[PDB]
Design an enzyme around this catalytic site. Structure first.
Site, PDB file in Angstrom:
ATOM      1  N   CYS A   1      12.929  59.252  23.464  1.00  0.00           N
ATOM      2  CA  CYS A   1      12.979  58.857  24.873  1.00  0.00           C
ATOM      3  C   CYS A   1      14.036  57.808  25.223  1.00  0.00           C
ATOM      4  O   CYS A   1      14.760  58.004  26.205  1.00  0.00           O
ATOM      5  CB  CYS A   1      11.603  58.452  25.381  1.00  0.00           C
ATOM      6  SG  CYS A   1      10.905  57.001  24.575  1.00  0.00           S
TER       7      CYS A   1
ATOM      8  N   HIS B   1       6.573  54.833  26.426  1.00  0.00           N
ATOM      9  CA  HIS B   1       7.505  55.878  26.822  1.00  0.00           C
ATOM     10  C   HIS B   1       8.440  55.389  27.915  1.00  0.00           C
ATOM     11  O   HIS B   1       8.040  54.570  28.740  1.00  0.00           O
ATOM     12  CB  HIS B   1       6.720  57.122  27.272  1.00  0.00           C
ATOM     13  CG  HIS B   1       7.564  58.267  27.724  1.00  0.00           C
ATOM     14  ND1 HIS B   1       8.519  58.833  26.898  1.00  0.00           N
ATOM     15  CD2 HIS B   1       7.513  58.968  28.879  1.00  0.00           C
ATOM     16  CE1 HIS B   1       9.038  59.834  27.583  1.00  0.00           C
ATOM     17  NE2 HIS B   1       8.458  59.960  28.779  1.00  0.00           N
TER      18      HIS B   1
ATOM     19  N   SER C   1      10.913  63.885  26.097  1.00  0.00           N
ATOM     20  CA  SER C   1       9.523  63.718  25.693  1.00  0.00           C
ATOM     21  C   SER C   1       9.162  64.996  24.989  1.00  0.00           C
ATOM     22  O   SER C   1       9.830  66.007  25.208  1.00  0.00           O
ATOM     23  CB  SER C   1       8.643  63.540  26.932  1.00  0.00           C
ATOM     24  OG  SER C   1       7.269  63.475  26.606  1.00  0.00           O
TER      25      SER C   1
END
EC number: 3.4.17.17
Lengths: 28, 245
Positions: free
Chosen positions: B111, B146, B163
């Site tokens: 990410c 994330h 992702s």
């Protein structure tokens, strides 16, 4: 010249391993 | 347990073996799988995708889709070893060099690497504003972290990212407010039984590739798990208004 060869081998293994792990995550 | 390559290229034997020992433990086929790759005399060379280039025949949604597609072709990194180190506090000039290195080495990304690459590939388009969107989520007794790259262009919000879940990365330029984009990620996390504990909105990333400035990753931090949506909205909208001011 020999240096770029190990990188090309490592990349071919990285993508061969990544294809396998994607599939494993797909299952699990 | 996640590893970051600190040996450069080619990967050193220590990092390389550790990656192999990890995939042999996580995988039920372990060593058979590892030996099949490592001992194969011939292994097919993967294709190097072309770095996308902005054309006048493209709309901003087209250009963003081309950037996302390149990131998808690089693939999400499922090895457990992140190939390129991303120091968050590092000046943008440094991170743009790492972005260029990613396009040259052409390997799977996670990410954070995708956010830096996204900034790199949109620096030349001045109508596109970029800002990091960070999530801290909870699932089965553990915390997850994330990051995606938020986009603002012509009164619409969207995102670029990477992702392992299709619904937690790219979003098209159709969100009328920042809140709609965030709430969509929150509803997308819901599909995976994750509870969003924190939302972090950074500042607009300068378009200058040789910038001395680090990225600001947390101008706004919200505890969205403890808040009601009217209040998350109020906060996100006050901040997005300030970003556009």
């Amino acid at each position: 010249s020999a240096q770029q060869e190990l990188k090309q081998r490592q990349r071919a293994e990285i993508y061969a391993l990544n294809r396998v792990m994607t599939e494993l995550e797909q299952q699990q | 347990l996640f590893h970051v390559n600190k040996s450069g290229f080619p990967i050193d034997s220590h990092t390389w073996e550790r990656m192999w020992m990890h995939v042999a433990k996580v995988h039920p086929k372990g060593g058979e799988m590892v030996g099949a790759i490592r001992n194969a005399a011939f292994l097919a060379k993967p294709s190097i995708p072309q770095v996308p280039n902005y054309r006048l025949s493209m709309t901003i949604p087209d250009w963003l889709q081309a950037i996302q597609n390149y990131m998808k072709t690089l693939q999400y990194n499922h090895t457990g070893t992140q190939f390129f180190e991303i120091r968050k506090m590092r000046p943008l000039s440094g991170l743009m060099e790492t972005a260029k290195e990613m396009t040259r080495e052409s390997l799977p990304i996670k990410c954070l690497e995708a956010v830096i690459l996204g900034i790199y590939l949109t620096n030349g388009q001045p109508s596109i504003e970029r800002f990091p969107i960070s999530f801290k989520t909870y699932f089965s007794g553990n915390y997850f972290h994330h990051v995606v790259l938020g986009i603002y262009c012509n009164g619409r919000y969207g995102s670029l990212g990477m992702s392992r879940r299709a619904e937690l990365m790219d979003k098209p330029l159709t969100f009328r407010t920042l809140s709609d984009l965030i709430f969509d990620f929150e509803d997308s996390y819901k599909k995976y039984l994750h509870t969003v504990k924190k939302v972090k909105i950074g500042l607009y990333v300068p378009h200058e590739p040789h910038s001395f400035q680090p990225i600001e990753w947390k101008q706004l931090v919200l505890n969205v798990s403890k808040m009601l949506r009217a209040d998350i909205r109020k906060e996100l909208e006050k901040y997005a208004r300030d970003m556009r001011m």
